[PDB]
Structure formats: structure tokens, C-alpha cells
């Protein structure tokens, strides 16, 4: 069916939400630009934490540290993402930018991926993928500027809310402790 307001097709997809399904969204791996998708990084039945952003979005490079450090503290049953998106605050935006990161909107995803050496050269060793140029994914997730969530089986089992900054990382602690908690006992 076409929307004769849009000229395009009609949506019928529900936006992503907890307790439905994970879209299998599309991403980009950096080395070689291949084609795949979100579920590509899921290992059988752990859980796998999704972390979108950019270098010019603070609260995502705020949080980066504490991120790794869930990485080590979680990854003997838990497997983490980086999604790198469009910039939060391009230098050639409309509005001026104060960010320590001088990055001009991506054009093409030669630029993405130069962005997201950036990051890298942070997170030594952690899984990342970029985007596509269409931000298949970042659409997808509703997780534009930045977001968190994690997905297991197929099914979103955290969504990162939208509200005060801080928050997030605290909440997708919370329940990262509640599932090892439920797996080997509480740490004493």
C-alpha cells in the first residue's frame, strides 16, 4: 500500500520496545565495509548489550569508561555492542559546537568509519560496527544522539529510557547485576 500524503509505502512496524522483538537491523562492519546486521552479533542465548553513539554526543563518551568496565565485570555471560551513528553535534552544523571532537557530518561511510577510529583508539578491543549511511539501525533502535539496550534471544529485554543523563548506565547496571545475580548467586 502507498500513503497518498507520502507518496511512499506504509509502515506497519511497531517501534522497538521492551518485550518485543529486537529488530534485525542493518550495520556495517568497519574493516571492509560488510554488510550485516544486529542479530549477527548475538552468541546462542546470552544477552547482548547494544551501545549507539557518536564522539561529538557527551553523554555517550562520559559513560565510555564505565562501559568498558561492565565489558570486564559482565562478559563471562553477556556480549557487548558499539554502534557508532551520526554525530550529535557535527563542526559543520547549524548551531556552534563546543565539543572536544571536530568531526563534520559523515557523507559517506568512509567518514563514519574514520569517526569511529576515533573512538577505537579508546576502547582498545571492543566489538563495534558503524551504522549505515541510510541509519538503518539508529531508526530501527529510536536511538538516535545515543541509546542502550540489550537484546537476548531474539527479544529487546532492556530499552534504555530517555530522561536525565546519568541514568542509563546506572539502570542497565541494575540489570546486568540482576541477571548474574540469577546465574551464580550474589557477589558478596
Known sequence: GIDPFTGQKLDFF?????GGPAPN????????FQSQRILDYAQGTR????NFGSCTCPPFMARMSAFQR??????????????YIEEAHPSDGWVTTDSPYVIPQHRSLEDRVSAARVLQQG?????????TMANSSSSAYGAYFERLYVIQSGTIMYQGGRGP???????????????????HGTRP
Open 14 to 18: 511497531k517501534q522497538a520496545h521492551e
Open 70 to 83: 561492565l565489558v570486564t565485570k559482565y562478559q563471562r555471560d553477556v556480549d557487548f555492542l558499539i554502534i
Open 25 to 32: 537491523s542493518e550495520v556495517v562492519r568497519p574493516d571492509g
Open 47 to 50: 544477552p547482548l548489550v547494544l
Open 123 to 131: 576502547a582498545p578491543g571492543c566489538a563495534l560496527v558503524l551504522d
Open 165 to 183: 543523563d546519568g541514568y542509563q548506565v546506572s539502570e542497565l547496571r541494575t540489570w546486568l547485576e540482576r541477571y548474574d545475580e540469577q546465574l
